[PDB]
Amino acid sequence: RECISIHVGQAGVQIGNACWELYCLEHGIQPDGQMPSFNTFFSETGAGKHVPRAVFVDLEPTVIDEVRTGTYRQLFHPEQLITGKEDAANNYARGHYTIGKEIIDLVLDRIRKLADQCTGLQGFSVFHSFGGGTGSGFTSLLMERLSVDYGKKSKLEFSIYPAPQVSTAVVEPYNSILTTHTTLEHSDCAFMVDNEAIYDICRRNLDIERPTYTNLNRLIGQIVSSITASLRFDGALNVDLTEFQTNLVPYPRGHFPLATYAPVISAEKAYHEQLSVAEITNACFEPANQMVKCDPRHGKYMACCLLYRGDVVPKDVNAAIATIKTKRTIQFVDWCPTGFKVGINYEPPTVVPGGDLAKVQRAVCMLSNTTAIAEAWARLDHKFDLMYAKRAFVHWYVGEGMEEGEFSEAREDMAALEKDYEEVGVDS
């Protein structure tokens, strides 16, 4: 019943920092590993120290060093903290090939070591970003190997969705297009969120006009914990990760369920207001709490999964579902009946001490696969096209051995993906 977390790149690792901090908060784990009390994620020592079963990869020493100098440096095993010396430079060509390919063997052997520590490997999940060099480059490299060795294990990916308006990486389209090509075909499911959309959540629901990544990742951590800690904890409907895959992936392509999370409420907003299960789920179908800037009303739904924490009575859930099925404007694709996975954990929602979110007594996470995602690809299509037509920055990949045909090909694969969304949109 075990799983492995993999943190690649800054985004992967810094999100991971929040994630493991939250898992410590879930059980009262001390920075040194001492836990007085979740062995699905952790491995126990004779001292009662538990080791989070995870791998941290950075090709630049700095971020891992940040871990190594922080409080959780005692928690993590030195072998889990893997670092190279040089970067990918925002570039798949080095991340996947030239540079990252050198260290990956080590990385894999640490993974395999942990796989041998697992007794019942259920699977794993990889945290990264769609635009970066290691964030997406190295990441896909890893998938190429992991899908061989662990072909039957859960291969869930979580990635930051490139913001349409702000991006620090000029060749991000190129990176992301190459990842599509290689991840679609290897991964089982990839989830993503938009930091821009999140900012809007922070300013509207948390009332914060100063979000940093350390805020943004707390919110992400919430979502992740709902599906990682609480799915291993007790509930009414205990849903596994493999079950998630078995209930969220409808086609052999990928699919890309997007996150939505409600409650996201400031402490003051929690006052004077009573949420019910149904009210929280109402919020879950509002564009306003959509974690990716993509309009839910534009597309049609294919999948939807609702996962519940704390004070949730199935009775209320059932009523809530009835209304979301019938009251809303949620259009859905023919193919699908509304079999929405309901996970119901008794495990209460948790809050980070010193965080922004209010203590809540119940909480709902929503995953959804909508046809509007093709518009996200359309965004990438043109951004890629523009660059590629001019061949701007192309020498930074070509010099590492990339082929122009390959890039065209990858775009075409994306186009095919868009076409399959088109297909799904056609009802039948």
């Binding site: 700095t62 040089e86 990918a88 620090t168 991000e172 930091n195 999140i198 701007a392």
Partner: protein, 426 residues
């Protein structure tokens, strides 16, 4: 992971004098060589620029090169000239005299072998080089002349390392050497294809900034080279220190170069205003972005809104929100969409470091690659042609064996860069 820096020419040597000063400031390293800081980070990534010698002495990984001992001596005589080891002072005797031919082609060429040997010794001292940086003037004899020669050999030895250089570009008003455009022309001919990237610094623009926004009436070159070092140091510290974004020089180079030949940069810097107004300034991300976008805060005598922007890098130092940065950069892109090139979606890229420059809460470095740069080339090329026809001072150069057809090709090559900027100006 490490960088080697080589300074050359009177300009380059004096700029480096400020550069290294700042780097040691950043890390708390005393003018005599030992570390007396007070932050973990200060020593943590020191390796990129210093070798720790026995006794907790730090040796700046750089070579000081000239052909006149006196300049070298003056450098050595000040604080931080003592931190450099004697072995990093490589110099000859008898000038160059601001003559490319002497520097590159003949006499200075002789010295380069000893320089390179020391370079090799340092390349071995490093664990893993990220790259090299050189400081010099485009119209100078050793600055460009000898310096260029060195670059061609270093690149040859290390194709896989970053080769960049910062150079003083002849300002429209103050040329010193009559053939300064000639030397510059020759350096383009050699440098552009033998470098990964070059930065364009105009002293005239710098003198305007120092009075325009800084309202100063006494600067010297040390004060202006302080500003230069602010941009240079800004770039590498992030690479050195923990941040949020993507802090690798090579990745910067990748994001800023859309085409093999067009790698010229316009540095700018924020915040950068007089003390009077400091009581009336607010420190926000939009505040920095206002200063960064404004052409008057550019250190290059160009005008980015005249040309088109190919690439923009915004590097931030200090604690800022990601949201705010993202939004303001987007806004910039939006509002100045008429200057950006349509081929590159979201042409403004960012990098974020969480360490502020000593004494400030926040700061930002503007790096741009516009088409406007071509205007500098045009000015030089034109001036060159006139001189070319007359052979002004070319007897000095041809006397040392420089052939006019080589110069002819150099002229073409200048014109080629302009035409390629036009090819992507659209």
């Amino acid at each position: 992971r490490e960088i080697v820096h080589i300074q050359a020419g009177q300009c380059g040597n004096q700029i480096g004098a400020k550069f290294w000063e700042v780097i040691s400031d950043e890390h708390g390293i005393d003018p005599t060589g030992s570390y007396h800081g007070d932050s973990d980070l200060q020593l943590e990534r020191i390796n990129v620029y210093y070798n720790e010698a026995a006794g907790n002495k730090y040796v700046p990984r750089a070579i000081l090169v000239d052909l006149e001992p006196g300049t070298m001596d003056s450098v050595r005589s000040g604080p931080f000239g003592q931190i450099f080891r004697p072995d990093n002072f490589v110099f000859g005797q008898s000038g160059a005299g601001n003559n490319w031919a002497k520097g590159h082609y003949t006499e200075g060429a002789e010295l380069v072998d000893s320089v390179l040997d020391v370079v090799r010794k340092e390349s071995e001292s490093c664990d893993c080089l990220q790259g090299f940086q050189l400081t010099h003037s485009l119209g100078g004899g050793t600055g460009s002349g000898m310096g260029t020669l060195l670059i061609s050999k270093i690149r040859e030895e290390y194709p896989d390392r970053i080769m960049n250089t910062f150079s003083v570009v002849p300002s429209p008003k103050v040329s010193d050497t009559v053939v300064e455009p000639y030397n510059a022309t020759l350096s383009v001919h050699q440098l552009v294809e033998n470098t990964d990237e070059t930065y364009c610094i105009d002293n005239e623009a710098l003198y305007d900034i120092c009075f325009r926004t800084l309202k100063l009436t006494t600067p010297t070159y040390g004060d202006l080279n302080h500003l230069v070092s602010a941009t240079m140091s800004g770039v590498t510290t992030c690479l050195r220190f923990p941040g949020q974004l993507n802090a690798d020089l090579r990745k910067l180079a990748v994001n800023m170069v859309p085409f093999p030949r067009l790698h010229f940069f316009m540095p700018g810097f924020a915040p950068l205003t007089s003390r009077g107004s400091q009581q009336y300034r607010a420190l926000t991300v939009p505040e920095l972005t206002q200063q960064m976008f404004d052409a008057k805060n550019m250190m290059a005598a160009c005008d980015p809104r005249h040309g088109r922007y190919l690439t923009v890098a915004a590097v931030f130092r200090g604690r800022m929100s990601m949201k705010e940065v993202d939004e303001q950069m987007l806004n910039v892109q939006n509002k100045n969409s008429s200057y950006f090139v349509e081929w590159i979606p979201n042409n403004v890229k960012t990098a974020v470091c969480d360490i502020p420059p000593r004494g400030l809460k926040m700061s930002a470095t503007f790096i741009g690659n516009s088409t406007a740069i071509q205007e500098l080339f045009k000015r030089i090329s034109e001036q060159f042609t006139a001189m070319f026809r007359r052979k002004a001072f070319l007897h000095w150069y041809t006397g040392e064996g420089m052939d006019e057809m080589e110069f002819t090709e150099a002229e073409s090559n200048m014109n080629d860069l302009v035409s390629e900027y036009q090819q992507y100006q659209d």
